Copies of this chain bind each other. A is one copy, B any other.
Amino acid sequence: ETLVNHRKELALNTALFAKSLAMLGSSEDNTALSRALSQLAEVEEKIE
Protein backbone atom coordinates (compact mmCIF):
# COMPACT_ATOMS: atom_id res chain seq x y z
CA GLU A 1 0.00 0.00 0.00
CA THR A 2 2.89 2.42 0.56
CA LEU A 3 4.12 1.40 -2.91
CA VAL A 4 0.68 2.26 -4.34
CA ASN A 5 0.99 5.56 -2.45
CA HIS A 6 4.38 6.70 -3.71
CA ARG A 7 5.08 5.02 -7.10
CA LYS A 8 2.31 7.06 -8.74
CA GLU A 9 3.74 10.38 -7.55
CA LEU A 10 7.17 9.05 -8.53
CA ALA A 11 5.81 8.63 -12.07
CA LEU A 12 4.42 12.16 -11.79
CA ASN A 13 7.90 13.32 -10.73
CA THR A 14 9.33 11.75 -13.89
CA ALA A 15 6.66 13.65 -15.84
CA LEU A 16 7.86 16.82 -14.11
CA PHE A 17 11.41 15.82 -15.05
CA ALA A 18 10.19 15.90 -18.65
CA LYS A 19 8.50 19.28 -18.08
CA SER A 20 11.79 20.57 -16.64
CA LEU A 21 13.05 20.50 -20.23
CA ALA A 22 10.41 23.09 -21.14
CA MET A 23 11.63 24.92 -18.04
CA LEU A 24 15.08 24.79 -19.66
CA GLY A 25 13.40 26.06 -22.82
CA SER A 26 12.49 29.04 -20.63
CA SER A 27 16.27 29.61 -20.29
CA GLU A 28 19.43 29.58 -22.44
CA ASP A 29 18.93 27.51 -25.60
CA ASN A 30 22.12 25.67 -26.61
CA THR A 31 21.65 22.71 -28.94
CA ALA A 32 24.51 20.68 -27.40
CA LEU A 33 22.73 20.97 -24.05
CA SER A 34 19.38 20.37 -25.74
CA ARG A 35 20.40 17.06 -27.34
CA ALA A 36 21.76 15.83 -23.99
CA LEU A 37 18.61 16.75 -22.08
CA SER A 38 16.26 15.45 -24.79
CA GLN A 39 18.23 12.20 -24.72
CA LEU A 40 17.89 12.13 -20.91
CA ALA A 41 14.12 12.54 -21.46
CA GLU A 42 13.74 9.17 -23.14
CA VAL A 43 16.34 7.74 -20.71
CA GLU A 44 14.20 8.60 -17.69
CA GLU A 45 11.04 7.54 -19.54
CA LYS A 46 12.55 4.10 -20.21
CA ILE A 47 13.68 3.86 -16.57
CA GLU A 48 10.24 4.93 -15.29
Main secondary structure on chain A at its contact with chain B? helix
Number of interface residues of A (CB under 8 A): 6
Q: Out of B2, B3, B13, name the residue touching A2 (CB < 8 Å).
A: B13
Which residues of chain B come closer than 8 Å to A13, judged between CB atoms? 2-3, 6
Q: How many copies does the complex hold?
A: 4
Which residues of chain B come closer than 8 Å to A3, judged between CB atoms? 13
Which residues of chain B come closer than 8 Å to A6, judged between CB atoms? 6, 9-10, 13
Residues on A lying within 8 angstroms of B by beta carbon are 2-3, 6, 9-10, 13
Question: Nearest residue in B to A2 (C-beta to C-beta)?
Answer: B13
Which residues of chain B come closer than 8 Å to A9, judged between CB atoms? 2, 6
